[PDB]
Ligand SMILES: Nc1ncnc2c1ncn2[C@@H]1O[C@H](COP(=O)(O)OP(=O)(O)O)[C@@H](O)[C@H]1O
Ligand SMILES: Nc1ncnc2c1ncn2[C@@H]1O[C@H](COP(=O)(O)OP(=O)(O)O)[C@@H](O)[C@H]1O
Ligand SMILES: Cc1ncc(C[n+]2csc(CCOP(=O)(O)OP(=O)(O)O)c2C)c(N)n1
Ligand SMILES: Cc1ncc(C[n+]2csc(CCOP(=O)(O)OP(=O)(O)O)c2C)c(N)n1
Ligand SMILES: [Mg+2]
Ligand SMILES: [Mg+2]
Ligand SMILES: [Mg+2]
Ligand SMILES: [Mg+2]
Ligand SMILES: [Mg+2]
Ligand SMILES: [Mg+2]
């Protein structure tokens with residue numbers, strides 16, 4: 375009866391586990407999208423995100439897209455804290471019966487992403503496994519690190535692009551349809567081949583008081599920002615940026631676009647704060663709320679309940 | 687009717703990856719990148735359940751090993767470890783204490799090697815997976831290319847111990863003799879040879895660590911340097927414990943020294959005169975023009991661990 379009452383990961387939760395890990399390591403740097411380290415008057419940003427078969431993607435998806443996404447989700451953490459991607463490593467867990475062509479096409483996608491984001495994969499690892507596992511490590515660089523702590527009272531809360539598209543794309547992919555309409559393919563693109571907002575780096579680096587990307591969902595991720603900055607975040611649902619593709623999807627399948635914008639994950643858009651006075655004539659940012667004294671995240675006045683994707 | 691990984695092989699696959707990426711840096715234990723007049727060394731090694739360890743093993747040792755095997759690649763190319771990240775694939779039914787103890791082991795290793803884990807990732811999974819990424823630094827990078835004609839070939843410590851340790855564990859015995867526990871310790875808690883960094887930086891022409899097996903890894907060195915490596919089995923360093931093990935179970939220690947993996951000792955080359963009398967290094971062969979790896983004048987087929 376050794377394991378009769380022992381606490382398992384399912385009971386603690388992923389973030390409670392990270393808290394334990396941080397405490398165990400007596401770490402002061404853990405908590406942001408990247409780990410900033412001082413090196414030669416500048417800061418290098420270290421991060422790692424993974425794509426596991428059955429968890430983040432399916433083997434039926436074109437390998438090139440998975441390779442593009444593998445690099446993109448990692449670049450997203452780097453640009454979210456004000457840095458530019460430089461060097462990456464890829465650790466692969468591969469089934470011995472996997473087609474060689476899958477790995478080749480995967481790297482063609484990786485190469486395409488690296489050429490786009492201006493970074494390079496300089497190495498990695500290979501291990502046998504039951505299914506496909508893709509663990510990428512990325513090193514970026516910045517002149518001014520912007521993490522999740524730093525949001526100031528009075529600041530406005532912004533997001534880039536539109537929210538909820540990726541979740542719709544995921545659902546469309548899981549439908550295994552023999553044919554998708556144009557708007558559906560666009561949503562699928564947002565899910566399978568997200569584009570890290572590297573176009574935002576200079577703005578974030580120069581004006582953001584707090585910044586991060588949205589990978590689990592707006593409310594859930596806004597919660598992390600609120601807690602690390604020690605403030606209250608008030609969001610207005612009517613201001614959330616929605617794409618016409620998402621609206622078409624919700625109309626066709628009977629869904630609520632606001633639900634997708636608030637709880638949909640993997641959009642990899644940015645969530646940051648700074649004075650409303652600060653803006654950019656070329657960026658698609660949308661003001662969705664403000665930073666107030668207190669705690670928790672509120673939507674339309676209600677504190678609701680932060681959902682977001684959970685591994686356990 | 688399409689080629690699968692098991693048909694191409696791990697290294698044939700890496701060759702394809704390198705070509706696809708048009709990479710010139712891939713090929714060594716670490717990837718050296720120029721930065722701030724110096725070089726940063728990037729590397730990643732992993733421990734997967736059922737592949738590198740069993741869930742029944744003490745987690746503290748797994749944590750120590752996770753860091754150690756990565757530090758091994760860094761110090762093998764002349765660098766010192768600095769910052770690491772750990773990506774974990776974890777089953778939701780796993781005990782929280784397992785992860786805590788794993789990190790206690792990671793913390794101990796970091797304190798010993800003087801590096802720090804600054805972040806990582808968590809993903810749900812069916813099997814335990816531990817992927818470590820490490821960034822090191824060096825004033826002089828020493829990779830697998832550079833071995834010179836006439837160079838003596840050296841190794842650190844003893845070879846074959848880890849393989850014996852694994853075999854002992856697989857026996858699942860109630861209890862083992864002291865020498866058997868010593869071998870098990872070498873398998874479960876290897877120690878990266880960070881004590882060789884200065885030596886490698888100052889005098890090595892080529893260097894790497896032995897993780898798959900002496901002959902198999904020497905083959906990588908021989909090919910990247912474009913030379914032939916002649917090894918003499920009688921010179922291979924054997925521990926008293928490995929000899930005791932082979933005596934007890936009727937095995938040949940030379941077989942373990944040549945094909946045993948996970949010892950994480952170093953394999954490097956340089957003129958014999960640079961032999962350091964303060965380090966546990968042993969001359970096991972020489973570098974000469976040509977190709978291939980020979981043992982006692984016989985071209986032995988490169989075995990070593992293969993994932994597929
Ligand atoms: N999946 C991968 N992608 C890119 N490079 C890889 C990958 N796997 C291995 N490599 C590179 O292949 C070379 C040999 O790797 P490996 O056999 O694991 O030796 P080591 O563990 O000593 O680095 C190294 O340069 C490694 O970085
Ligand atoms: N296994 C781990 N070990 C150490 N730190 C971790 C681990 N997993 C996650 N972290 C850290 O916890 C914080 C939150 O991680 P995560 O939820 O993955 O957000 P993100 O992907 O934006 O970095 C980050 O600082 C991350 O580096
Ligand atoms: C087959 C499949 N099922 C479900 C999902 C949904 N999903 C899996 S992970 C995730 C979001 C973020 O992934 P994570 O590993 O948490 O990245 P991080 O948030 O750590 O950057 C989502 C919405 C998916 N992408 N694929
Ligand atoms: C349960 C189990 N079975 C078999 C082994 C043997 N084994 C697995 S990996 C490996 C050696 C090296 O591992 P690898 O992932 O290739 O590390 P790298 O050479 O890339 O540094 C060995 C000898 C083991 N350690 N554990
Ligand atoms: Mg991160
Ligand atoms: Mg993030
Ligand atoms: Mg993450
Ligand atoms: Mg992330
Ligand atoms: Mg997440
Ligand atoms: Mg390596």
Ligand SMILES: [Mg+2]
Pocket residue numbers: 715758759762894895896897
């Ligand atoms: Mg090595």
Ligand SMILES: [Mg+2]
Pocket residue numbers: 498499500730731
């Ligand atoms: Mg390796």
Ligand SMILES: [Mg+2]
Pocket residue numbers: 715731755759897
């Ligand atoms: Mg290695």
Ligand SMILES: [Mg+2]
Pocket residue numbers: 897898991
């Ligand atoms: Mg190997």
